[PDB]
């Protein structure tokens, strides 16, 4: 759900 | 399951790591030099806040990093996030004694860490790290050498092998560019040395710079971005 | 300076000369203990070796060139990350336990307060140390270098910048003396400079142990159940929490 | 200071 998640992957 | 990393020779790793680079960002242009702690922190965490973002960006530009899992990267950032903010700072202040460049129209000086509490010890250690590098004569393809080793060495330990060997391979980095530069096989070992201890003062200050992010969380008085929430928050 | 006329084997032998003793802590096996009691252990282990520390620091080559007062600072900044990495060292050989003393050997199930992290990253080290298979001959030097170059960049006057100056040129030879271990041990010099910056790198990790201890000390100080001896206090309080 | 008188001795 982490943020970092996100950008890691975009 | 091979890293292209590990395949790159000592110029393409620089290059590679050169061509990552982030960019030297701005901060708002109101010509008011911050003096209370609300404008001042805002600032900074405004800035910070656009810097992470590059930052997770420049990560993935660094060879190896990519080849772990995305909890792998998640750690290791969670980890070295503000030691990676630091040394780019202090990197960025290296030709400015007795400042700290934040961003081209933000350079402060210790006066004006005074009006925050605790963070002129924050900025002190930030200049002495400046002074030492400048003193040094660090170069840009040492720096971003540096850097790479603290995003992949800082959590390494709170988990391997792929990382201790891409950290190999940047070792190998850093003695060629000084055996580039001409400096005999002593310097070469003597420098390595003086710029890894370093590491040591970057993660003291990240780790005293994480507890005073903290204590302005708990101030409640500067808004922090979601993001730079859950980064602090990975600290415990 | 009688420190920076040493030769590589010299100061192998000066600083293996010139460690500490390893010492009993009051652990008693039929005894129950709280977490409470355990901390009272540890405290009362740490005050003592404290002393034994203090003696070493003196044996360094260098250190007594400092003035009384930079002398001070240096051990006020590294003393937890010296404990730690002696403890580290004496845990190399019991994998999932630190022996904190040879009779008291524990694992991170005595972790319980929040000292289980600590305990973690601690057998993390050792485990690192087992995997690089430290030598003895290495471990002295990284203590030296601990106690040289932590408080180094936190120290006034063009003056006083002289005695930063003399810490470095120690520094340097303690880096010439593990380039020389490893040599002697057959390592090429690609292997020689990458085993140098896989055991500098581990002071970075050190580093931060010594934060995170540092902090959890100053909890339970204000918790006020463990008693912390007066030394130990005075440490603390040196890091200003 | 502990630590000053210590080193001292
Ligand atoms: O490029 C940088 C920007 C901000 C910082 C810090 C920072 C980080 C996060 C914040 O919310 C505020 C300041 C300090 Cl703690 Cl040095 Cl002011 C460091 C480097
Ligand atoms: O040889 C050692 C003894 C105690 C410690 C620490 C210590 C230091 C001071 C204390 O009051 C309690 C524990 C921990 Cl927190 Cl790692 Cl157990 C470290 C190494």
Known sequence: HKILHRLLQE | ?236
Not at chain 2, 39 to 66: C, Y
Not at chain 2, 92 to 102: A, C, D, I, N, T
Request: aromatic share 6%.
């Open chain 2, 1 to 236: 399951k091979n890293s292209l990393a590990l395949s790159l020779t000592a110029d393409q790793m620089v290059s590679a790591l050169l061509d990552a680079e982030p960019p030297i960002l701005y901060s708002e242009y109101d010509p008011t030099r911050p003096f209370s702690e609300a404008s001042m922190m805002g600032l900074l965490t405004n800035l910070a806040d656009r810097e992470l973002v590059h930052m997770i960006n420049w990560a993935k530009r660094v060879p190896g990093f990519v080849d772990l899992t995305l909890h792998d990267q998640v750690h290791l950032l969670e980890c070295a996030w503000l030691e990676i903010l630091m040394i780019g700072l202090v990197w960025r202040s290296m030709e400015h004694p007795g400042k700290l460049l934040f961003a081209p129209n933000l350079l402060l000086d210790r006066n004006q860490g005074k009006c925050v509490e605790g963070m002129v010890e924050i900025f002190d250690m930030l200049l002495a790290t400046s002074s030492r590098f400048r003193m040094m004569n660090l170069q840009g393809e040492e720096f971003v050498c540096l850097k790479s080793i603290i995003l992949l060495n800082s959590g390494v330990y709170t988990f391997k092998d792929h990382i201790h060997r891409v950290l190999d391979k940047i070792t190998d980095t850093l003695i060629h560019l000084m055996a580039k530069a001409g400096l005999t096989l002593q310097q070469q070992h003597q420098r390595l040395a003086q710029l890894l201890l370093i590491l040591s003062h970057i993660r003291h200050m990240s780790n005293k710079g994480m507890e005073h992010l903290y204590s302005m969380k708990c101030k409640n008085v500067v808004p922090l971005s979601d993001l730079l929430l859950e980064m602090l928050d990975a600290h415990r």
